[PDB]
């Protein structure tokens, strides 16, 4: 038949939708207790010294 | 007989099943499955209104 993923996962066409926004916490939507410990996102725009963008 | 079938006895209109959380209900509400509701009955007296 024809169907979409709301009915069953068999009709899911994707194999993992990787969605990201604000790779550096300029918005501080997530608060790192220890920012130095976290790996940089592949879309990050910071040098090694910096851990996250200024608020 | 006394303790087993007089002071406490099996009753009709009773259901049993597992409980699961639901924070979207009020404290005075209980979620009930469709089958349990469709099985047991409540007798309403017919009136003109």
């Amino acid at each position: 038949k024809k169907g979409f993923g709301k009915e069953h996962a068999k009709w899911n066409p994707t194999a993992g939708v990787a969605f990201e926004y604000d790779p550096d916490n300029a918005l501080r939507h997530t608060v790192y207790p220890k920012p130095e410990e976290w790996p940089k996102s592949e879309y990050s725009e910071l040098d090694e010294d910096e851990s996250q963008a200024p608020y | 007989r006394v303790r087993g079938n007089l002071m406490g006895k099996r009753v009709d209109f009773s259901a049993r099943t597992v409980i699961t959380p639901d924070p979207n209900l009020s404290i005075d509400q209980v979620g009930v499955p469709r089958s349990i509701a469709a099985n047991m009955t409540f007798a309403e007296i017919v009136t003109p209104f």
């Binding site: 993923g5 069953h8 996962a9 068999k10 899911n12 | 099943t17 597992v18 699961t20 959380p21 924070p23 089958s35």
Partner: protein
Amino acid sequence: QEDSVIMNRSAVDRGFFRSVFYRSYKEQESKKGFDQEEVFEKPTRETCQGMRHAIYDKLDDDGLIAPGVRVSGDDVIIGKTVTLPTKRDCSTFLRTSETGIVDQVMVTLNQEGYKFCKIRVRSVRIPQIGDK
């Protein structure tokens, strides 16, 4: 909250923790009585006496349901009748609220040499709200 799990419905749809449940119903023909005789046969309302609301139609000519037939609550899978000293029905019944499909039906001779029948009903259990 309070020892409960949120499960990924898509994972369940993809086979996550989905299982089967095989239940076997056994029945035994008997001739121990001097006159009353059990027999595996399809019972009929015109002949037998003690039937119920369930439907005696999925059975075969030998009184045993065939494999691959869906069954539901209050379905008959073994047509066994005792000869009344005309006859009375004592037939195996599916347990309340248990669907499934008959997987295998084996007929043989048991230790006593009587005719012995075992039906394996298979029911697929997908995880639901409330499964531990």
